[PDB]
Amino acid sequence: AVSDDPRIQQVLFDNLEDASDISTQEEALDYIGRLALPGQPKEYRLRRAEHIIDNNLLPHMGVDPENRRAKAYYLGMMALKVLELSLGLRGEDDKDHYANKRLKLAGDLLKDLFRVAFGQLVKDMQYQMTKTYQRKGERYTFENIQRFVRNSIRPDVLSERIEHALATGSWPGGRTGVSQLLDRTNYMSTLSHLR
Amino acid sequence: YNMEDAVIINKASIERGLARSTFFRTYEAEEKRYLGGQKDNFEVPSPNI
Amino acid sequence: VAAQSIGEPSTQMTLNTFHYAGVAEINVTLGLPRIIEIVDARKNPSTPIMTVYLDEEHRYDRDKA
Amino acid sequence: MKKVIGSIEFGILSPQEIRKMSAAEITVPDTYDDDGYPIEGGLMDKRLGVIDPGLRCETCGARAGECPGHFGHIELARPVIHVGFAKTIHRVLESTCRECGRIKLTDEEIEEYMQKFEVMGDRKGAVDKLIKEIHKKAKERMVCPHCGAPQFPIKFERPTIYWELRKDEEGNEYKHRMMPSEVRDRLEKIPDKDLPLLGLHPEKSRPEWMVLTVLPVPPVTMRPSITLESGIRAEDDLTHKLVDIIRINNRLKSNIEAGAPQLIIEDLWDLLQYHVTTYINNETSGVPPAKHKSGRPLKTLAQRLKGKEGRFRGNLSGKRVNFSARTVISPDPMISINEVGVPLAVAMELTVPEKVTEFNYEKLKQRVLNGPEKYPGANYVIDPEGRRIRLMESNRELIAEKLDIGWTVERHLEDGDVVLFNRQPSLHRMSIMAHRVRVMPYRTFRLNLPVCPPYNADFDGDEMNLHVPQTEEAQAEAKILMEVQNHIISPRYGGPLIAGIQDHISGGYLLTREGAYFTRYEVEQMLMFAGMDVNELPEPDKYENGEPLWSGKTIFSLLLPDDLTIWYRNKLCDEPERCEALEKLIEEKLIPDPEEVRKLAYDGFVYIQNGKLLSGAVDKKAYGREDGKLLDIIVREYGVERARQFLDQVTKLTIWVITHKGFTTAIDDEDLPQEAIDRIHEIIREAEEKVQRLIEAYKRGELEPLPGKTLEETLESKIMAVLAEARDNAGKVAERYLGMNNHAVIMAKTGARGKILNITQMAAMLGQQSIRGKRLYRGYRGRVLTHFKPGDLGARARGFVTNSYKSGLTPQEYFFHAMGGREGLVDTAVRTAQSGYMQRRLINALQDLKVDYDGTVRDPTGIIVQFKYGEDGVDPMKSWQGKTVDVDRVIVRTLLKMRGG
Amino acid sequence: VNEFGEVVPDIPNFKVKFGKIRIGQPEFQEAQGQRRPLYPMDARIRNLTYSAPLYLEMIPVVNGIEQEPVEVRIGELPIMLKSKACRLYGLSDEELIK
Amino acid sequence: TTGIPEREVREYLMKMGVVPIEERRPAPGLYRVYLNGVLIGTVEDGRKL
Ligand SMILES: [Mg+2]
Ligand SMILES: [Zn+2]
Numbered sequence A: 001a002v003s004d005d006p007r008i009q010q011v012l013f014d015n016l017e018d019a020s021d022i023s024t025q026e027e028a029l030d031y032i033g034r035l036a037l038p039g040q041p042k043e044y045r046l047r048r049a050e051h052i053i054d055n056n057l058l059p060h061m062g063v064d065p066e067n068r069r070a071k072a073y074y075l076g077m078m079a080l081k082v083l084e085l086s087l088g089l090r091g092e093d094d095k096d097h098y099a100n101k102r103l104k105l106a107g108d109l110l111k112d113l114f115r116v117a118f119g120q121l122v123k124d125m126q127y128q129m130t131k132t133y134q135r136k137g138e139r140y141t142f143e144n145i146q147r148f149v150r151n152s153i154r155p156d157v158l159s160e161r162i163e164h165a166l167a168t169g170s171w172p173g174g175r176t177g178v179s180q181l182l183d184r185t186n187y188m189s190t191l192s193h194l195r
Numbered sequence B: 001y002n003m004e005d006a007v008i009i010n011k012a013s014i015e016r017g018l019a020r021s022t023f024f025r026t027y028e029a030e031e032k033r034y035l036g037g038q039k040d041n042f043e044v045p046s047p048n049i
Numbered sequence C: 001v002a003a004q005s006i007g008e009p010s011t012q013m014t015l016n017t018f019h020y021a022g023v024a025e026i027n028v029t030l031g032l033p034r035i036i037e038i039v040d041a042r043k044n045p046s047t048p049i050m051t052v053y054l055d056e057e058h059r060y061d062r063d064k065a
Numbered sequence D: 001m002k003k004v005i006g007s008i009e010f011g012i013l014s015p016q017e018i019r020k021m022s023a024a025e026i027t028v029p030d031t032y033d034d035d036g037y038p039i040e041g042g043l044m045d046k047r048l049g050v051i052d053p054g055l056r057c058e059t060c061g062a063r064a065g066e067c068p069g070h071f072g073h074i075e076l077a078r079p080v081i082h083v084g085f086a087k088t089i090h091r092v093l094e095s096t097c098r099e100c101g102r103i104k105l106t107d108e109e110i111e112e113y114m115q116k117f118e119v120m121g122d123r124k125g126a127v128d129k130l131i132k133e134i135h136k137k138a139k140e141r142m143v144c145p146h147c148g149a150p151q152f153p154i155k156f157e158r159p160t161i162y163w164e165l166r167k168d169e170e171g172n173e174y175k176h177r178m179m180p181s182e183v184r185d186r187l188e189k190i191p192d193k194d195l196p197l198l199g200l201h202p203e204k205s206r207p208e209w210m211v212l213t214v215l216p217v218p219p220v221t222m223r224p225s226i227t228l229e230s231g232i233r234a235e236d237d238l239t240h241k242l243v244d245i246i247r248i249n250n251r252l253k254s255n256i257e258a259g260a261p262q263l264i265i266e267d268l269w270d271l272l273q274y275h276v277t278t279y280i281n282n283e284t285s286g287v288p289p290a291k292h293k294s295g296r297p298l299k300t301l302a303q304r305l306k307g308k309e310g311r312f313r314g315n316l317s318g319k320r321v322n323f324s325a326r327t328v329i330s331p332d333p334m335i336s337i338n339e340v341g342v343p344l345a346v347a348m349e350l351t352v353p354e355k356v357t358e359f360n361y362e363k364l365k366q367r368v369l370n371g372p373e374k375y376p377g378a379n380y381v382i383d384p385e386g387r388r389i390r391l392m393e394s395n396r397e398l399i400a401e402k403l404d405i406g407w408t409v410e411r412h413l414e415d416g417d418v419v420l421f422n423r424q425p426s427l428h429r430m431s432i433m434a435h436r437v438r439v440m441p442y443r444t445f446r447l448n449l450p451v452c453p454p455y456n457a458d459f460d461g462d463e464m465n466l467h468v469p470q471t472e473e474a475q476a477e478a479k480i481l482m483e484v485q486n487h488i489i490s491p492r493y494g495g496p497l498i499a500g501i502q503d504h505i506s507g508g509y510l511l512t513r514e515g516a517y518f519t520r521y522e523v524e525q526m527l528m529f530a531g532m533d534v535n536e537l538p539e540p541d542k543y544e545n546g547e548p549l550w551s552g553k554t555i556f557s558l559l560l561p562d563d564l565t566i567w568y569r570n571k572l573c574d575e576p577e578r579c580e581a582l583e584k585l586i587e588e589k590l591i592p593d594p595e596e597v598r599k600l601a602y603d604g605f606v607y608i609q610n611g612k613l614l615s616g617a618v619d620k621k622a623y624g625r626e627d628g629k630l631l632d633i634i635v636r637e638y639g640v641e642r643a644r645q646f647l648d649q650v651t652k653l654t655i656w657v658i659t660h661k662g663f664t665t666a667i668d669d670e671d672l673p674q675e676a677i678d679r680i681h682e683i684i685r686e687a688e689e690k691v692q693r694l695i696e697a698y699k700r701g702e703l704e705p706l707p708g709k710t711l712e713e714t715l716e717s718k719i720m721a722v723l724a725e726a727r728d729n730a731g732k733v734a735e736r737y738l739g740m741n742n743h744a745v746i747m748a749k750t751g752a753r754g755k756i757l758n759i760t761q762m763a764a765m766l767g768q769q770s771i772r773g774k775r776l777y778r779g780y781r782g783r784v785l786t787h788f789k790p791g792d793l794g795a796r797a798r799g800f801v802t803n804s805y806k807s808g809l810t811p812q813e814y815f816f817h818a819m820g821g822r823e824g825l826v827d828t829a830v831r832t833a834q835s836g837y838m839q840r841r842l843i844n845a846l847q848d849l850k851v852d853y854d855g856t857v858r859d860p861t862g863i864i865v866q867f868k869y870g871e872d873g874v875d876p877m878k879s880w881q882g883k884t885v886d887v888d889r890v891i892v893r894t895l896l897k898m899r900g901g
Numbered sequence E: 001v002n003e004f005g006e007v008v009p010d011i012p013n014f015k016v017k018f019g020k021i022r023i024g025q026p027e028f029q030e031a032q033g034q035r036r037p038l039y040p041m042d043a044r045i046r047n048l049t050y051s052a053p054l055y056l057e058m059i060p061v062v063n064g065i066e067q068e069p070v071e072v073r074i075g076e077l078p079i080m081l082k083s084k085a086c087r088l089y090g091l092s093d094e095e096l097i098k
Numbered sequence F: 001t002t003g004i005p006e007r008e009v010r011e012y013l014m015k016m017g018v019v020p021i022e023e024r025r026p027a028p029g030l031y032r033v034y035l036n037g038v039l040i041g042t043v044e045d046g047r048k049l
C-alpha cells in the first residue's frame, strides 16, 4: 500500500521485521486501553481503544469502525512522504508560502458559533419534553406534540448564547479576540479596520 | 525653539481658523428596575442628606 | 552604579556589520546574548574557541604553521 | 522612649507560650447567624477582634477602626505532626537511639566535632555539608554506646506516616504503624546538650514542640467577611476551615471518652491529620484540596503569605505616590541649564509645608491672607496640635490674625523650591535629577535643551512626571546632592554627558570660520543676548578696510577664562601636512608671537593660548554628548559652578548667530551635474557584469572554492564582497564632487544629525539589501518575485537596488527595500525585552556593597570583597580615560602658567 | 441542520423531523408585543440588537405517519449591515438620506 | 475565493479523461492528479491536461 518502488521498498522491510514479529494482530489495540488507563479494566480495555482510534485518528475521514479501513490506505500515503525526504526526493515545504495558507473569514467562523448554540437548544428541548410526560400524562392524541413543542422551547436560550459569545470575544472553541469594536475616528481608519 | 522636532506656528493663522477642532462625549444614564418592585425616578434631589 | 552602568548599553545594543569582509573568525555569537552567557555559569557554552600562539620557530613561516 | 528594631530572632512557638498569648478558647463552631445581632461565644468577637458597630472587646473598648486583633488557641485533644517539619523529623528519628538519648557516637568522636562549630559560625552554606555527614554516618549503624546494642530497626517516611521493620515472633518484619503520641514521647528524652550537634537550639526551638499540641487561632481582623452582591455574606476561607476543625474536634472528644469501639479512633485520627495539613498548605502533596461548595479552592496560610502574588511585590515594595503631576514636554533654550518650567495650573495643586519661624513671618501672613485662589496664596494651615484647618470656606481673615509662631502654612510652589524630575523607564543612574522651579502660563513642562541626553527624551509627545519632597531634611538633601551641575560628567565613561546638541554644534562652526566678519551692530546686539555683561570693551576692530568690523574669533574668545592653554587636532582636518607645519612651532617655542604662523592658521587645529582663540574652528570636539575635550577640561580645572555659566552662555550665543544668518536646506543640495551622473552609471554596469562572469564560472565547474564554506556558500561570499566595494566606490565619488560649502554636508562633517553614508545614499546607489546576513532567498519555488526568470542568481534579480532616492525606485526595487526595512522595526522592540530582565538580576545581587571609611568594600556579613576599592583609588567619575592623575597634562599646565608670566 | 435530523425521545411514539429554515425581516417586539420594522440608525441610538427572527418547521412523526408540520420561531440571529437580507440592500441614495 | 460544491467538479474531470485509482502502478507512470489534497485519479500526459 505504501509504494511499489524498489528503492523506497527496501527501507521498509527493516522497520517491518523489528516489530511485526513481536506484536500479532489486534493485541496492539489492547495495548492502547492498557497504556491509556493504568488499572485493570479487562472488558473496558478493547473499548477504550475504539474511542481513541475513532475520535482522534483522522476524524475527517470517518468516525465509525468501518471507516478505519479507509484511513488505513490514507495513513500509508502520508507516511511515504516522510520516508522519501530522508532519502531525498523533495524540498521541505515552507509553511509561510501563501499557497498552503487559507483565511477563514467572517462567514465560516459564524457557522462554528451557530452549530454549538443550536446543539444546546436541541438538547434542552429533549429533556424538557420528557419532564412534561409524567406530570401531564395524556392530552389530545395528534395534538400532543403540537402543544408539547411550543411549551418546551423557551426561545431566549439560543438567542442569548449567540450575542454573549460574539460581544465578548471569547468563543466556545477556545479562541479569543474574534470580535473587536469598530474604530471609528477619521474615515480612513474605519475602512482600513474592516480589512 | 524648534530644535529636535518641534514646530513654530504663526499666531495670526491660529487666530483666524487654521486647525481648530471640536471634541465630543456622551453619557448614558438609564433607569434600572429592581426585582423587588421599586424604581429609580429622575427627580431633582430634595435638599436633604 | 556598577549594575546600572553595565545594564544601560544593552538597550543601545544595535547591530554591527555582521557579514564582515573577513575569513578567519566565523560565527562567534557576538552581541547581547554573549554577555548573558558570561554573566551565568553554564558548563556547555555555544561555539567555543581557543586561541593558540606559536613560539619563535613557527612565528613567521607558512609551511611550519 | 522611641527605640528602633535592632534584630529579629526566629524560632518555634512553644505550647507554653501559646496559652498565655491566647485570649480565649474557641469552642462554638459557627460564623455569624443571622442578618441581625452578630455575637457568638466561639470564633467571633469573644475577646478576639471587633468588626461590627458594637464596642465590646477585651475591656479596652477600641472600635473596629484601628484595633489590632488578638490571638486565640485550640486545646487539641491529641498530638498532631506538623507537615512542614516532616522531612527534618526523619533526620532526627533515625539518627539517634531510642530510650537513651545519645547521638550513637562515642564521646571522643563527639568531642572533636565541637571545634568545627566555632570556626564556621557565620557561613550557612558550608555548615550544611557537615550536618549531613553526621547524618549519613549515624544512619548506617546499630550499636549505641549506652544501651548495649539491642538491634535497632530502621525508620520509614513519605508523606507523613512512619514505620519500623522490627522483629517480634522469631524472624518477622511486620510494619508497626506510628502514632504522633509515640513519636513525641521519644523526642523529650534527647538531652539539651545534643541539640547543637543536630540542627536545633536548646531555648528557641525544642524538637518535641514540632508535634502540634495547641493550634493558635488568627484574629478577626485578618479574617474579613466579603459581601457578594448586597446581602450575601461570602464567608472567609480561613473561617470555614477553622469551623471545620472545631466540628471534627468537638465530636472527637465526645466520641472517644464515652464509648470506645476502637475502630473510630483509627479513621478519625488520620482525618484530623489530613485536615490540619490543608490548613497549613492547601497545595500540599498527596492531599485532596478541601474546597468550599462552589469549586473554588481555599487559599490557606501557605497561599496567604505567598503563592507568587501575596504581599511582598504587591502592596509592600511598590506603590503609587502622592504629590506628583504628569504631562507633555516642549523646549525653551532661554532658561538656565538646571531650571524647569512648571505650568501655573500644576503650581496651585501642589504645596510645600513651610513652618513659620521669625524671619519669614511677614511673607507668610500675606500668603494665607491671599486665600486659595490667587497665585501667591495658601491652601492649609496647621496648628501645633496637628489638626489641619482648610482655608477655603467663606473666610480666611480670622485665620490670618496673629498667626503665632510655631504654626505651619502650606503655600503654593514659588520660584525656587526644589523638585525632582523623572522620565520613567529609569535605566541609568542619572534619570532622576533635582531642578529649580520657575512658573509660566500654559500647560507643558519646559525643559532646557542640553538636558536631553540624560533623560533620553525627545519632544514628540513624551511625558515626564515631577514629585516634590516635603520634610526639611529631605528637601535640603535633594538640593545639595542631586542638582544638575554636579552631573556633567557621567560615571560610565570619562566624558561630558550634558552638552551641546544639533543646532549648538552646527551654529558654532559658522561663527568660527575663516571670514565671518560681524558688523558692529550685530556684536553689540548679541552680547546682550547671552547674559554676559561687559563694559565698553568690544574693542578694537580688527578690519577697517570696508568698514570697522570684528573678526569672529574675538567674539567667541570673550567666554573662555584668561588662562586656558589647550591645543588639539579635530574632525574637520583634511590635509595632514598643513596641520604638521604648525605642530612643531608649539613644541620648540611654547610661547611664540601670534603673528608669524599662527596667523598662517588652518581650520582644523584648535589653538587657544591664555584666553585667546588664535587658530582653529569649533565643532563636535568642544561641546557634544560624546567626547569633547574643551568642556571636559573646564570642569576639572575650574570647579563645577563655572562650567554651567560657560555652558549656558555658549548656548544662547551660538543660537543667535544661526538664527539671524540663515541655515536652510533646499532640494538642489543633493543634485550632481550630468558628467558626474554618467560616472556613477559606468560603475554600476561593470559591477553587474563582474557578477555575471562569476555565475558562469559556477555553472561550468571551474569554481576554485574558498576553504571553510561549502561551494554554494563560497559563491555567495564572493558576490557580497564584489558589490560592497562598488557601493562604497560610488560613495567616494559623492564625497569628491559636491563641495563642502553647501548647507547639507556641513551638518554631516561636524556631527549634528549626520553620517556621510546617508548623504551619499541620496544621490548614488543604495547598494545591496540584506536580511540578517544572507541575501534574499525567501520566495517562490526558484525565484524571489514572480517578475524574474526561475533560476537567476544575478545581481539585479537577488535584490540589488540601482536607483537612488532622488531619481526614484522602480516597482521591483521598491519591494526589495521593504524587506530590508522590516528588519530594523522587529529587532528594536525585541532587544529591550532581554535587557530589562537581565538588569534585574545584577541589581538584586550587588545593591548591598558600600565603601567603608578605611577604603574597603564589604558585603553585609563582613566578608571582605575587595581590599582598597576598585584597584585603588580613583573614582570613575573623575578619572582620565581609564588612567589616573595624568602627568602629561599637569606638567604642561603649570609650566606654561609660570613661564608665560 | 441536516446533520442532526432525527434524534430521540425515550417514549417510542413521538419523533420530530427537521424541515426548512426561512429568514425573516428585521423586526422587534417591545413590552406589550407590537411587531414594527427596524432601521439601523434607530437601533444604535436606543441600545437594541439589530437582528432577524429564525423560523423552523418541525414534523411530528407519530407511529411512522406524517400529519402536520408546524413552523415555530427559535429566536434571533444578528444580521450584518448592508447585507442581502437587511432592509438597506439595493436602496437608492435619496432614500438612504431620508 | 467564494466557494463551489465538490459535486460538479469531480464529475466534470472524470467525464473528461481522469483515470481512476484502480489502474495505477503509479511511479514511474506519468500520473498523480490531486483535488484539495485528496488523491483522486491519474492522467496520461501532463501538458495536455
Ligand atoms: Mg519619545
Ligand atoms: Zn482589642
Ligand SMILES: [Zn+2]
Residues within 6 Å of the ligand: D097, D099, D100, D101, D102, D144, D145, D146, D147, D148
Ligand atoms: Zn543507650
